[PDB]
Amino acid sequence: IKVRKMKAIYHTLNLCNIDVTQKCLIAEVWCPVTDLDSIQFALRRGTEH
Amino acid sequence: SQSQGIQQLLQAEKRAAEKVADARKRKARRLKQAKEEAQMEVEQYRREREQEFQSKQ
């Protein structure tokens, strides 16, 4: 499970923009409107970790 | 705007690139400054040794 998630996460980051345009990663996503706050809270967890 | 923010990030990255380029240019020119400034120190050494030699004589 560890290695499979790691592989999936890296393959997902592949889909995102790279330093060819900016040192900060750019991500594009579909999201339901109601879950935007939850996604922001998840990003907050990511920042803290 | 999203495009406005992306352009702002790109401009900031360009500013950072300019900063690092300026620092590299400073290093490159200070290399020649290092080449040249040794003349002052060698002159100081020569003058000090001449003073000591003449005093001893």
Q: Give the closest-approach CA distance of B13 to chain A in angstroms.
A: 7
What SS3 state is found at B23?
A: helix
CA angle A9, A10, A11 (to 5 degrees): 90
In whole angstroms, give the CA distance from residue B45 to residue B19.
38
Q: Are B16 and B8 in contact (CB under 8 A)?
A: no
Solved with: cryo-EM
Resolution, angstroms, 1 dp: 3.5
In whole angstroms, give the CA distance from residue A19 to residue A36.
26
In whole angstroms, give the CA distance from residue B28 to residue A1.
51
Chain A residues touching residue B6 (CB < 8 angstroms): 22, 26
